[PDB]
Structure formats: C-alpha cells, structure tokens
C-alpha cells in the first residue's frame, strides 16, 4: 500500500495473507468470506507469463494478523488449503478480466476479535455504493512505493497498511490505460489535481477494497486488488476485480463445493 498508514488492531479482521511455504514468501492478500472460504485474485495463483501456477500444497493462509514480521500466536490462525478454484474465464493473457479465485480451507476457522468475515455485496449495494467520488478502503502488506528498478525489490511494512480511495468515473478509468478494461473491473484513486495520493501496489493483489454501508453499517467487499501500471503514478489508477459482477460464479462454487 502506497501513502497509507498503520492499521489499528483488528480494523480489518477479514484480512488474509496468502503465503508460499517454500521458499517462504508473503505472496498476496486475500479476504475471509466465511469460516471455510477465502477470496483472492486469480493471478496470485496462476499467471503463466511469470511462470506462476501454485497448487494447494505450495501454500498456506495466515488469518488474523497485524504484524507481518513475527508469528502472533494469540491471534493468528494458519490454514491448510483443501482446494483452489480459479475462475474458468480468467483472462490472464490479455487484461486480467475476471481476476478472481476462491480457496476452500480444509477445516473451518473459528472467529474471534481478530478473525471475522467481510460481507459480499448484492446487486443494489453494488449499484448504490459504486459511485464516482465515493471512497473505499484497501489494506495489505504489499510494497510501500513503486521503485526505480524492478530489481530494487520489496519495501514492505511490518504492520498492515490501510488507505482510503475514491472510485473514479469509468470514462476516466478507460482513458487512463491502454489495457482493455471490462465491466468486471473498476478503478479507484485520486486524480492529478485532487492533492491526496495513495494506491495499492505489488503484493497487495487479492486484498479487499471494502466499503462501509451507511444503511446497516456493515463492511462490504466491493473489490479485489487486481492490477495497475506502476504504483501511485499521476493520471494512473488502481484496478479492482468487481466482486458483485462475479458473484454468481462465487455462489456456484460455494454451493457446489464444500
């Protein structure tokens, strides 16, 4: 997360860490949507152009975390994956259309003050909350900034980072990139002359872009950090996998499996 700040403890109890077991590596973010299911981006699990294709045994999930640098035994929960489900029409070769995947835990995880599921929006929530100017929140342990060389590497925080960002109007999202955008994504971020800055970044993929509903004051996951060109670049915006748009697939998966 770029230009965000340290999260308050338990401020994002649905936050999940997708972790490569060996060689150890924090791969991406993810979100808890029930005691057995975790939502993340497809490209974190499968992305041929980078020789990425992780199977269940290569990974684990770390839930309830605050600091990345140590195992937090009183709040943290580690889960083995029983099965990964990438969206069958996940378009990796072109524009990450439908960048979404589900991971079923082998066992249900117990909830606590630090582990709690986020809500998925229904048609109207999507319709009423996804408006230009409305702000959502993005969290993660990804990089703090775009670096001058890909090799510079990773500048990661120790504590979960949070940043609030405004949804931008589709014509602007479209004109901002040459990548073909689709109705299954939306973009968020401040415009060049809005002053404020902030964006998600490498390592944030799969994390939730949540919104608090003014009607029932529950938190809804409207997006999934998916892609962007650089991080926090002017006239550039982060892109998120539109969750309501892919909700029928999510429900079919959950109702058919586990």
């Amino acid at each position: 997360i770029v230009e965000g700040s340290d999260a308050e403890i338990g401020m994002s109890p649905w936050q999940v860490m997708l972790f490569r077991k060996s060689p150890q590596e924090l791969l991406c973010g993810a979100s808890l949507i029930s005691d057995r299911w975790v939502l993340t981006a497809a490209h974190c699990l499968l992305y041929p152009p980078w020789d990425k294709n992780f199977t269940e045994n290569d990974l684990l999930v770390r839930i309830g975390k605050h600091s990345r640098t140590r195992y937090e035994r009183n709040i943290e929960k580690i889960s083995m994956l029983e099965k990964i489900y990438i969206h069958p029409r996940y378009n990796w070769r072109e524009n990450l259309d439908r960048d979404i995947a589900l991971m079923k835990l082998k066992k249900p995880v117990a909830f606590s003050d630090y582990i709690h599921p986020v809500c998925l929006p229904d048609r109207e929530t999507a319709a009423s909350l996804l408006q230009a100017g409305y702000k959502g929140r993005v969290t993660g342990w990804g990089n703090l900034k775009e670096t001058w060389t890909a090799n510079v590497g990773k500048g990661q925080p120790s504590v979960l980072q949070v940043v609030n960002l405004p949804i931008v109007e589709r014509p602007v999202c479209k004109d901002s990139t040459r990548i073909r955008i689709t109705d299954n994504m939306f973009c968020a971020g401040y415009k060049p002359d809005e002053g404020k800055r902030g964006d998600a970044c490498e390592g944030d993929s799969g994390g939730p872009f949540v919104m608090k509903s003014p009607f029932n004051n529950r938190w809804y996951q409207m997006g999934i950090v998916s892609w962007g060109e650089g991080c926090d670049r002017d006239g550039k915006y982060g892109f998120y996998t539109h969750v309501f748009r892919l909700k029928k697939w999510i429900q079919k998966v959950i109702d058919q499996f586990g």
Partner: peptide
C-alpha cells in the same frame, strides 16, 4: 458465518469507530 458478516468485534460491536472511517461516510 455471513449472518454476522462485516461487523467488526473490536469496532462496530463495541460501538467504537476507527480513525478514518468517517472519511468514507463523508464521501457519500
């Protein structure tokens, strides 16, 4: 357990707000 989804044990359930939550509400 999506019945209780989206309600944070350390915030909503304790009637406590977080430091930037208000910024979102005002955006509406």
């Amino acid at each position: 357990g999506e019945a209780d989804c989206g309600l944070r044990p350390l915030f909503e359930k304790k009637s406590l707000e977080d430091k930037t939550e208000r910024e979102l509400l005002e955006s509406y």
